[PDB]
Point group: C2
Chain length 93, copies 2
């Protein structure tokens, strides 16, 4: 009865979390791509080497960050869904 | 009963969320710091269509990070309420 309240509340939180992740992931992936583009671009222009090198380092840091983000969100996402399904079962029983 | 397993599991999940945010936040702020220093370096170096794009990216990320701080603040305050309530029920 109150268990129903928490389920509702958690379900909403987990949906919100998912939606934010979709938004973040797009924002950061476009971000990276534009970085990529600008690294390609600077490499087409050519002293200016410190700049391109540093952008390349930054592209790869981010790129590395997003891969690990994908894996981490994938795991938490299944752990929260698993848990919501358990709540679902326990409330209605 | 089994609402114990559910509480404990959610506790752990919420702590991991929290841990991974601080790791996240750090990684991206440092990343933004460099980007800024870089923009600021090139600005003084400067064709110049690139500093425009560079300064665009910086605020793109800076915006994202301020937004995130707020979003994370809200979510975690919600999950704290919920856990408190859940452990109250056990």
């Amino acid at each position: 009865g109150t268990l129903n309240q928490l389920f509702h509340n958690l379900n909403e939180i987990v949906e919100d979390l998912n939606k934010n992740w979709h938004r973040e992931r797009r924002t950061l992936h476009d971000f990276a791509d534009e970085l990529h583009q600008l690294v390609k671009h600077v490499h087409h222009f050519m002293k200016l080497q410190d700049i391109v090198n540093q952008l390349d380092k930054l592209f790869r840091d981010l790129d590395n960050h997003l891969q690990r983000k994908d894996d981490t969100v994938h795991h938490r996402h299944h752990q929260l869904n698993k848990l919501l399904a358990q709540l679902d079962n326990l409330v209605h029983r």
